[PDB]
Amino acid sequence: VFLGFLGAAGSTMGAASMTLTVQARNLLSGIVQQQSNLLRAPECQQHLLKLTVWGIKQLQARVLAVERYLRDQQLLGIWGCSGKLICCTNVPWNSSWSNRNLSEIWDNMTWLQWDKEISNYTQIIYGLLEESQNQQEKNEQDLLAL
Amino acid sequence: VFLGFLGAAGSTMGAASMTLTVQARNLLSGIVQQQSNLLRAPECQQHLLKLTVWGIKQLQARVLAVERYLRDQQLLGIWGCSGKLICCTNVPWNSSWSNRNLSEIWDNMTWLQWDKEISNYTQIIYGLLEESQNQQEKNEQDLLAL
Amino acid sequence: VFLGFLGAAGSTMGAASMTLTVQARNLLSGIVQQQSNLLRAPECQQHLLKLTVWGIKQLQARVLAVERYLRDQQLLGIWGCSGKLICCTNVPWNSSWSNRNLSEIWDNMTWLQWDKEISNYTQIIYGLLEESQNQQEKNEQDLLAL
Amino acid sequence: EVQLVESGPGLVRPSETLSLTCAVSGDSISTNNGWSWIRQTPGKGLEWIGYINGRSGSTRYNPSLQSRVTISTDTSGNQFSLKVNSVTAADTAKYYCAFFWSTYYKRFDVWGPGVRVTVS
Amino acid sequence: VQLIQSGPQFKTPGASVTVSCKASGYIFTDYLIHWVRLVPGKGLEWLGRINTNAGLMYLSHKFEGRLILRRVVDWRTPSLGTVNMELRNVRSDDSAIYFCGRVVDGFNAAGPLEFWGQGSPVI
Amino acid sequence: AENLWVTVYYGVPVWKDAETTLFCASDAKAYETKKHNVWATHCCVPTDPNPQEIHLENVTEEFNMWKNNMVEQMHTDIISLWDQSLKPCVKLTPLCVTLQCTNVTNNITDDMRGELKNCSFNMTTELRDKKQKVYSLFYRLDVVQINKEYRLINCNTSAITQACPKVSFEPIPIHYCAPAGFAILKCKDKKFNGTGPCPSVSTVQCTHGIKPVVSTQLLLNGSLAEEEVMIRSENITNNAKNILVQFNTPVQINCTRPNNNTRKSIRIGPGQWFYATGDIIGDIRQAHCNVSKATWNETLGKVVKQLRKHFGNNTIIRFANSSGGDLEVTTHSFNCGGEFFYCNTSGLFNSTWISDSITLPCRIKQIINMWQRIGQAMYAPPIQGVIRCVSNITGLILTRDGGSTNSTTETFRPGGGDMRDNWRSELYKYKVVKIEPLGVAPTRCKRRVV
Ligand SMILES: *[C@@H]1O[C@H](CO)[C@@H](O[C@@H]2O[C@H](CO)[C@@H](O[C@@H]3O[C@H](CO[C@H]4O[C@H](CO[C@H]5O[C@H](CO)[C@@H](O)[C@H](O)[C@@H]5O)[C@@H](O)[C@H](O[C@H]5O[C@H](CO)[C@@H](O)[C@H](O)[C@@H]5O)[C@@H]4O)[C@@H](O)[C@H](O[C@H]4O[C@H](CO)[C@@H](O)[C@H](O)[C@@H]4O[C@H]4O[C@H](CO)[C@@H](O)[C@H](O)[C@@H]4O)[C@@H]3O)[C@H](O)[C@H]2NC(C)=O)[C@H](O)[C@H]1NC(C)=O
Ligand SMILES: *[C@@H]1O[C@H](CO)[C@@H](O[C@@H]2O[C@H](CO)[C@@H](O[C@@H]3O[C@H](CO[C@H]4O[C@H](CO)[C@@H](O)[C@H](O)[C@@H]4O)[C@@H](O)[C@H](O[C@H]4O[C@H](CO)[C@@H](O)[C@H](O)[C@@H]4O[C@H]4O[C@H](CO)[C@@H](O)[C@H](O)[C@@H]4O)[C@@H]3O)[C@H](O)[C@H]2NC(C)=O)[C@H](O)[C@H]1NC(C)=O
Ligand SMILES: *[C@@H]1O[C@H](CO)[C@@H](O[C@@H]2O[C@H](CO)[C@@H](O[C@@H]3O[C@H](CO)[C@@H](O)[C@H](O)[C@@H]3O)[C@H](O)[C@H]2NC(C)=O)[C@H](O)[C@H]1NC(C)=O
Ligand SMILES: *[C@@H]1O[C@H](CO)[C@@H](O[C@@H]2O[C@H](CO)[C@@H](O)[C@H](O)[C@H]2NC(C)=O)[C@H](O)[C@H]1NC(C)=O
Ligand SMILES: *[C@@H]1O[C@H](CO)[C@@H](O[C@@H]2O[C@H](CO)[C@@H](O)[C@H](O)[C@H]2NC(C)=O)[C@H](O)[C@H]1NC(C)=O
Ligand SMILES: *[C@@H]1O[C@H](CO)[C@@H](O[C@@H]2O[C@H](CO)[C@@H](O)[C@H](O)[C@H]2NC(C)=O)[C@H](O)[C@H]1NC(C)=O
Ligand SMILES: *[C@@H]1O[C@H](CO)[C@@H](O[C@@H]2O[C@H](CO)[C@@H](O)[C@H](O)[C@H]2NC(C)=O)[C@H](O)[C@H]1NC(C)=O
Ligand SMILES: *[C@@H]1O[C@H](CO)[C@@H](O[C@@H]2O[C@H](CO)[C@@H](O)[C@H](O)[C@H]2NC(C)=O)[C@H](O)[C@H]1NC(C)=O
Ligand SMILES: *[C@@H]1O[C@H](CO)[C@@H](O[C@@H]2O[C@H](CO)[C@@H](O)[C@H](O)[C@H]2NC(C)=O)[C@H](O)[C@H]1NC(C)=O
Ligand SMILES: *[C@@H]1O[C@H](CO)[C@@H](O[C@@H]2O[C@H](CO)[C@@H](O)[C@H](O)[C@H]2NC(C)=O)[C@H](O)[C@H]1NC(C)=O
Ligand SMILES: *[C@@H]1O[C@H](CO)[C@@H](O[C@@H]2O[C@H](CO)[C@@H](O)[C@H](O)[C@H]2NC(C)=O)[C@H](O)[C@H]1NC(C)=O
Ligand SMILES: *[C@@H]1O[C@H](CO)[C@@H](O[C@@H]2O[C@H](CO)[C@@H](O)[C@H](O)[C@H]2NC(C)=O)[C@H](O)[C@H]1NC(C)=O
Ligand SMILES: *[C@@H]1O[C@H](CO)[C@@H](O[C@@H]2O[C@H](CO)[C@@H](O)[C@H](O)[C@H]2NC(C)=O)[C@H](O)[C@H]1NC(C)=O
Ligand SMILES: *[C@@H]1O[C@H](CO)[C@@H](O[C@@H]2O[C@H](CO)[C@@H](O)[C@H](O)[C@H]2NC(C)=O)[C@H](O)[C@H]1NC(C)=O
Ligand SMILES: *[C@@H]1O[C@H](CO)[C@@H](O[C@@H]2O[C@H](CO)[C@@H](O)[C@H](O)[C@H]2NC(C)=O)[C@H](O)[C@H]1NC(C)=O
Ligand SMILES: *[C@@H]1O[C@H](CO)[C@@H](O)[C@H](O)[C@H]1NC(C)=O
Ligand SMILES: *[C@@H]1O[C@H](CO)[C@@H](O)[C@H](O)[C@H]1NC(C)=O
Ligand SMILES: *[C@@H]1O[C@H](CO)[C@@H](O)[C@H](O)[C@H]1NC(C)=O
Ligand SMILES: *[C@@H]1O[C@H](CO)[C@@H](O)[C@H](O)[C@H]1NC(C)=O
Numbered sequence A, B, C: 001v002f003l004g005f006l007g008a009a010g011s012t013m014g015a016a017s018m019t020l021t022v023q024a025r026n027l028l029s030g031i032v033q034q035q036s037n038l039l040r041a042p043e044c045q046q047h048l049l050k051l052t053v054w055g056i057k058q059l060q061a062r063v064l065a066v067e068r069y070l071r072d073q074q075l076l077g078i079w080g081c082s083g084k085l086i087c088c089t090n091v092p093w094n095s096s097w098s099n100r101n102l103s104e105i106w107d108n109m110t111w112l113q114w115d116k117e118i119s120n121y122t123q124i125i126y127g128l129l130e131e132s133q134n135q136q137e138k139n140e141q142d143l144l145a146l
Numbered sequence D: 001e002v003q004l005v006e007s008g009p010g011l012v013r014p015s016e017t018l019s020l021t022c023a024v025s026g027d028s029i030s031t032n033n034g035w036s037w038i039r040q041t042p043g044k045g046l047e048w049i050g051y052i053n054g055r056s057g058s059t060r061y062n063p064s065l066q067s068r069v070t071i072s073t074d075t076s077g078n079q080f081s082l083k084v085n086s087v088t089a090a091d092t093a094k095y096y097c098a099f100f101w102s103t104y105y106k107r108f109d110v111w112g113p114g115v116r117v118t119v120s
Numbered sequence E: 001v002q003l004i005q006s007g008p009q010f011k012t013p014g015a016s017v018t019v020s021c022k023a024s025g026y027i028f029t030d031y032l033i034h035w036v037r038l039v040p041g042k043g044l045e046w047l048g049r050i051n052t053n054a055g056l057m058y059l060s061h062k063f064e065g066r067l068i069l070r071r072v073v074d075w076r077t078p079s080l081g082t083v084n085m086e087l088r089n090v091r092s093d094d095s096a097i098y099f100c101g102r103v104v105d106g107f108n109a110a111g112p113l114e115f116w117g118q119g120s121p122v123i
Numbered sequence F: 001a002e003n004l005w006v007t008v009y010y011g012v013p014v015w016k017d018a019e020t021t022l023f024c025a026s027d028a029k030a031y032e033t034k035k036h037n038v039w040a041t042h043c044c045v046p047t048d049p050n051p052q053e054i055h056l057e058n059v060t061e062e063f064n065m066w067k068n069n070m071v072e073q074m075h076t077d078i079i080s081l082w083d084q085s086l087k088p089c090v091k092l093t094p095l096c097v098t099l100q101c102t103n104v105t106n107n108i109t110d111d112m113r114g115e116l117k118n119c120s121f122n123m124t125t126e127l128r129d130k131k132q133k134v135y136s137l138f139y140r141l142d143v144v145q146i147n148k149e150y151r152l153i154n155c156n157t158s159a160i161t162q163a164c165p166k167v168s169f170e171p172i173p174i175h176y177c178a179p180a181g182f183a184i185l186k187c188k189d190k191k192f193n194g195t196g197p198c199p200s201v202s203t204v205q206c207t208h209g210i211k212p213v214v215s216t217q218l219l220l221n222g223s224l225a226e227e228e229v230m231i232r233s234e235n236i237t238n239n240a241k242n243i244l245v246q247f248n249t250p251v252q253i254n255c256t257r258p259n260n261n262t263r264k265s266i267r268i269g270p271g272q273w274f275y276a277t278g279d280i281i282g283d284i285r286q287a288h289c290n291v292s293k294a295t296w297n298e299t300l301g302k303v304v305k306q307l308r309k310h311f312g313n314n315t316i317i318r319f320a321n322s323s324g325g326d327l328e329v330t331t332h333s334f335n336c337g338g339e340f341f342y343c344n345t346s347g348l349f350n351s352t353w354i355s356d357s358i359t360l361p362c363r364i365k366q367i368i369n370m371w372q373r374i375g376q377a378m379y380a381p382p383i384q385g386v387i388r389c390v391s392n393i394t395g396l397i398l399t400r401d402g403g404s405t406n407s408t409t410e411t412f413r414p415g416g417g418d419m420r421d422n423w424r425s426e427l428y429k430y431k432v433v434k435i436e437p438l439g440v441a442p443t444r445c446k447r448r449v450v
């Protein structure tokens, strides 16, 4: 855990796609989330009760990490990707959002650069992914299929 | 998000089944759960620390939304529906719980009316769904299958 | 719910594998997590606000149950088991971790005894399960498959 | 509610292609997937030929005719048709136009009267 | 349902006398509270009534310049509350047993009294 | 009997009535620069970005404004905010000492005779071995004559705190907003009487803006009825319940506190300050409120027209003034430009209906018990200069006396009652429900085991 947490950040999209579990494992487990799960009492705890302001700040940090995690999982569920780090969809690429070939982006760009190129199309793409899944379920409820 | 949140409430069960992502998206995202995830500090936060009672009420609301969400997801997992908004099971309908044909309920009833008709059979049905999944796993652990 | 919560604890691994939903259902639902979800206000709540230390202790207990649940679910997701109480993997057994035949462990050992026999190989096994899933995804991204 | 009306040659010779059509009245064939052809052969009974999905144009054909039959639509005429290549005496049968609705909520068929086709 | 009154009082003529009635076991608001004076040599006389929710006083037209009714409530505890009475310029003519009582359910627009206290008395 | 199987659906638009905690929000525009406003600090979450409202076709829902937990919650939170903002203030314990008081006779009108007392006393100082002789003016209603010797009223029961001079309890509008998993349903029918099967319902993210104005008798600065004056009550024939009357047009009322007034601060301790009332500049006259006479005639004609629908169209309806043994049950209490007013409304509720302006004299107080507590008291610092407020009367709180005589008449008076009746006048349209997304139903599918 955290042995190369953002190690692929400067690498290409292709190479970086091979380290996806590395970042996923660090979204729900900060130091305080490890101390909170010791078999022994952590001892510190009395401090956070005697002084309730510190107790509240710690809980807010823990609750937020959980809420952010769950929201990303909910979107993957809605889009039809329950689990999987990499999933294919039926939404075609518009070639307006970005107009580059596969041999250019997977080999020459980093994920940070990509993110800064299509950031204002994010909501359009997410909207289409949701519509696609709804259409798929409508087709599933037809026993003659395709 | 929230552009027709309960819009299908007065519609029939059939039509309403086509809007399921609309309600699902609003279970983990109230206004305070959006403000809490800004890149900038929300600014308000000092108020909730200076006066710890308000800080606690806000956390209780956030924790509860998460717990309710997770409990529903756990039941779907137990019943054998990981993900999916609509899933088929192997539990037969009893015709005691409700005794109507498909052409009557999917076209003439709303979900609110349905809920008020079979509410005291809810636990029986949930119990059967769990038993069904356990039986399925017992059959899966047999390499000769069916 | 909780009608035989650890009832299989003294039973064999084989028999105990048939009660897995029994323990799973009790990880997110303690008494306070039921009182918190009443349609009526619980009434007690004012106590936990007037005296903020008790309010904080209760939230810490609730947040922790959620964090522990989610971490186990994240590991199952990473290892390629989204949902399911029982899942097969591609990691071979080393026969160093434990060197017993199937007819000995499934019929004569309890899960507690097993846990005390291979506890210091837990991290090795978990590491291998993650590597296996990453290798599987690398193979999936090849349209000629196997 | 729809009505299905078949029409076509009542006689085809060996190795010729048989072409039958079906008009649909009361609803559209650009949608309502499940437009199909069924064959009733004396001495064999009923079998499927195949069907078409009006919304996408995709088709499925019973394997026995996988290399012999084409099903397509005329959505302007709101009619659909069946063509079977290399027709032989063994293909003499009563041919039917049918609409099969099978979903999670409803099940029904509509059948036309059919066309009897003699094959020499 | 219980109405508890304060003990007997004696006052110098011309002085005011204050008596009270503590009510409990029913919602204090709702159910108007009435005061009745008993004179052994004359019979019962109505003095007035109070609306315990609004804090409004209605008096018999003999005592407008002499009798004031008040109520005390606490929204926290609906089953408890009090009604106080102040009678000014007390004279020997006012020797009486002063009673507290509560109107029969459904008769707030009227005044039959179902529940009664003990009687002060005063002088 | 069809061969059907159970199908599980998630995200089903179903709900149950529920109680919960709403989080409150505000419109972060002009209110954002208020800085020391209590409500602008608490209801910090920004809202009203052209908020959503969603019409629910074919939804009929049961409403009951008299059992609406949103009002109880609003009441509790208002009280808590007041206690929290006063809690860290000076605590004027040292003022409950014998005061030596004389009458103010300096250019007082007849209606102000005996209203103001000029009191001197021995106060503590910042250095703890000294005493100082100081004086302040007090209103008659704030002191008790004992044994020219006076004491403050709140000596027998409680310490008196002082509102912090920078804290502004101005009732800027706030909105109540549902937490995730819950929704607020709004009743849109015009002429909705507070209860029953409302056929036109929409969901909202938050309530409309509500100003948490606190008053008795006359409801100020609320919303107006859409078409006709509305009369709502839990039970109209039970003369124990209050009647809430919502106007469909405002009545404008102009309130003032004349007398130029000055303020001085006195150290009572090491950084601990008390605010005293100094000599009044100019002459001394009574506070008062002005209500247009023609308007407060036309609007009673409307109230009476509607009352007849419940009491008989051959019934005589008369209005009369409040009668009781206290100030808090006979006057129109409100906070104006920071000071507390207790105005006499007998000039308004005086008419019989058989089928220029009105001046209301008004008194003011500095020591306020607030809400319904026995202990706990607040001293409201005086405000320099003169005070003028322009407010809208949006509704009345009325009660009936009971029946009368065989002439068939009814008498209505300004009522009292709990502060909650002020919130019931705005929140009557809203209900809170819990969303329950799982459900099951028969279908023709069966899980295909593979
Ligand atoms: C909304 O609020 C109102 C209050 O404003 C609630 O209404 C009240 O409801 C209760 C029931 O819960 C009624 O109690 C019963 O009253 C009858 C007497 O009724 C007759 O006389 C009335 C006399 O009123 C006079 O004074 C008024 C006020 O100044 C004048 O205006 C009148 O003109 C009179 O001078 C009269 O008002 C009644 O008429 C009204 O009501 C009837 C309907 O009842 C209408 O048709 C009329 O048009 C008019 O509106 C009427 O003429 C008593 O007899 C009852 O006592 C019996 O039942 C009791 C049950 O607990 C029992 O304990 C008693 O011992 C007694 O039992 C006898 O009868 C039994 C029958 O089963 C037998 O088995 C038994 O052996 C025995 O013989 C009872 O006290 C209130 O009167 C009524 N109040 C008002 C003002 O109307 C309303 O319910 C609330 N609504 C909601 C939804 O909450
Ligand atoms: C029903 O709804 C109405 C409409 O909203 C509402 O009326 C309004 O009430 C508010 C609050 O009392 C009034 O606001 C005050 O107005 C005075 C007068 O200012 C005039 O002149 C200036 C230019 O000099 C103009 O900009 C202004 O618009 C006016 O024409 C101000 O002096 C007040 O400011 C002081 O008090 C504030 C308290 O919140 C402080 O925040 C502010 O900083 C000021 O305090 C400082 O200066 C003081 C003087 O030196 C000093 O004593 C203090 O210690 C401190 O240093 C304030 O803005 C508003 O004008 C009313 N509107 C109308 C049309 O009359 C009703 O009140 C409401 N009814 C009910 C029952 O709630
Ligand atoms: C409330 O009472 C106080 C006294 O406790 C009043 O203040 C006093 O006012 C008198 C004048 O009426 C002052 O006396 C004069 O002082 C000037 C110098 O400034 C001198 O030249 C004159 O010959 C005369 O002595 C007196 O000093 C002053 N005392 C204090 C402590 O200020 C106050 O005006 C009264 N207020 C009201 C509203 O009645
Ligand atoms: C940082 O950039 C350098 C230069 O592009 C990357 O170097 C490549 O490394 C691979 C693996 O050893 C070689 O096969 C390539 O030929 C190298 N590129 C060049 C131009 O020589 C380096 O890998 C990048 N860092 C990371 C973490 O990806
Ligand atoms: C509310 O109820 C009405 C009446 O049942 C629904 O009206 C139907 O609307 C569809 C779509 O336009 C038409 O094809 C039907 O013929 C209409 N029904 C009738 C009897 O005319 C309306 O859709 C319902 N509202 C919602 C949100 O479903
Ligand atoms: C506790 O241990 C006993 C002894 O091993 C178990 O007894 C077995 O019960 C099964 C089911 O009735 C029988 O078929 C076996 O023959 C019994 N074993 C023997 C040696 O007689 C008992 O089941 C165990 N408890 C639990 C919960 O598993
Ligand atoms: C402030 O305290 C002084 C005493 O320290 C008070 O003056 C005395 O009052 C008593 C009566 O209570 C007289 O018998 C003494 O002769 C007075 N002494 C002097 C020096 O005057 C004074 O009255 C107190 N002031 C206030 C405003 O209460
Ligand atoms: C609000 O209006 C409704 C009707 O729209 C009133 O309810 C009815 O009252 C009559 C008696 O006057 C009963 O006979 C009906 O059965 C009631 N109908 C329903 C659906 O309950 C209701 O009482 C009015 N509310 C108020 C406070 O006056
Ligand atoms: C309420 O109305 C009265 C009139 O009845 C106003 O008093 C007048 O004010 C003007 C301007 O200062 C004077 O010239 C008149 O002589 C006053 N008339 C009387 C009878 O005193 C009063 O100012 C109004 N109050 C408010 C708050 O606007
Ligand atoms: C309350 O005060 C307003 C002023 O703010 C008065 O309205 C003015 O009335 C005069 C006529 O007397 C008009 O010429 C002005 O143009 C009005 N001013 C505004 C801003 O509208 C109002 O009449 C007063 N109300 C009462 C009951 O006295
Ligand atoms: C309600 O109005 C009546 C007048 O109709 C007021 O009665 C006067 O009260 C004063 C004492 O406060 C007496 O000196 C007068 O003689 C009374 N007038 C008459 C005609 O008798 C009554 O005080 C008003 N109530 C309130 C609370 O203001
Ligand atoms: C409330 O206002 C009314 C009207 O001004 C007051 O009633 C008048 O009081 C004076 C004495 O100051 C009498 O001379 C009048 O005759 C009374 N008017 C009537 C119609 O009776 C009333 O006193 C005020 N209420 C209080 C508690 O002071
Ligand atoms: C209530 O209304 C009555 C009138 O119906 C007022 O009494 C009149 O007052 C005028 C002076 O303004 C006298 O000339 C009349 O002779 C009086 N008439 C009667 C019948 O008394 C009364 O003052 C009003 N009450 C209040 C509090 O203003
Ligand atoms: C209260 O009195 C003060 C002092 O006389 C008034 O303030 C003065 O106003 C004039 C203009 O008329 C200025 O030139 C002075 O500089 C001001 N003096 C001070 C110390 O501020 C004030 O306006 C009066 N207020 C009212 C409402 O009448
Ligand atoms: C008294 O009520 C009037 C009428 O509603 C208010 O004036 C309106 O305010 C709205 C904004 O809420 C504007 O869009 C309208 O154009 C205004 N109408 C007119 C005729 O000016 C008035 O602000 C209210 N007064 C108070 C003190 O709240
Ligand atoms: C959208 O993103 C592109 C990225 O190349 C940027 O140049 C453009 O300015 C963005 N549009 C807006 C309105 O910011
Ligand atoms: C069970 O539900 C039905 C719904 O039609 C209802 O009529 C019945 O009273 C309910 N049973 C109990 C015990 O509440
Ligand atoms: C590893 O586990 C075995 C279990 O049989 C135990 O005997 C051994 O001592 C453990 N090793 C260490 C270093 O604790
Ligand atoms: C007090 O009244 C007199 C007239 O009797 C006047 O000359 C003096 O200026 C007035 N004082 C004040 C402060 O108005």
Ligand SMILES: *[C@@H]1O[C@H](CO)[C@@H](O)[C@H](O)[C@H]1NC(C)=O
Residues within 6 Å of the ligand: F103, F105, F113, F114
């Ligand atoms: C002061 O007030 C009293 C009433 O408490 C009164 O009797 C006395 O005459 C008043 N004195 C002056 C100068 O107004």
Ligand SMILES: *[C@@H]1O[C@H](CO)[C@@H](O)[C@H](O)[C@H]1NC(C)=O
Residues within 6 Å of the ligand: F156
């Ligand atoms: C309590 O208040 C009364 C006046 O209502 C007063 O006479 C009494 O002395 C006060 N009690 C004490 C201890 O001062």
Ligand SMILES: *[C@@H]1O[C@H](CO)[C@@H](O)[C@H](O)[C@H]1NC(C)=O
Residues within 6 Å of the ligand: F293, F294, F297, F298, F353, F354
């Ligand atoms: C108020 O309305 C009544 C209606 O009967 C009328 O007699 C009275 O003169 C009106 N008052 C005013 C000031 O117009």
